[PDB]
Ligand binder design. Structure first.
Ligand SMILES: [Cl-]
Ligand SMILES: [Fe+3]
Length: 154
């Protein structure tokens, strides 16, 4: 079933730098890598799909002046994507989430959000959707997330 679309929210910024790492070795926060595939119709892993991510910092704050915690990549030849970041903090009124825009070559933009398992605000945030839940395990110093996007596209 194709990845549901959700609100952009207040804090998107166009023209994000191309980067698969949103942090450095001095960024505050609990380490988090989100990786997975983008599939199209009929389980075809999709190549060259744009993935533009953005999230709050460890304290729950979005960077409107710069491009902190903003960065986009393109899925590899085998369909995989990889995002190195830290766990975002709770912005007031929202459950923990990371935003993403996904765009297959020449198709319209999918704007959506990824959620974390076992967040208490999942009971109360109306935007929370199980289809958008990442799988998260505790690898090493920080946490590893996985999610597959499914795009209605051949
Ligand atoms: Cl949950
Ligand atoms: Fe947000």
């Amino acid at each position: 079933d194709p990845t549901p679309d959700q609100m952009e929210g207040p804090y998107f910024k166009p023209d994000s730098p191309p980067r698969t790492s949103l942090v450095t070795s001095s960024t505050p926060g609990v380490p988090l890598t989100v990786s997975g595939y983008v599939f199209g119709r009929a389980c075809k892993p999709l190549t060259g799909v744009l993935l533009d991510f953005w999230q709050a910092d460890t304290g729950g704050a979005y960077d409107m002046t710069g491009f902190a915690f903003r960065g986009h990549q393109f899925t590899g030849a085998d369909g995989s994507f990889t995002l190195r970041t830290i766990v975002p903090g709770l912005y007031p009124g929202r459950t923990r989430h990371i935003h993403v825009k996904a765009q297959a070559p020449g198709r319209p933009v999918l704007t959506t959000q990824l959620y974390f398992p076992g967040e208490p605000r999942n009971t109360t945030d109306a935007l929370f959707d199980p289809a958008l839940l990442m799988n998260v395990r505790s690898a090493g110093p920080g946490r590893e997330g996985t999610f597959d996007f499914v795009l209605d596209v051949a």
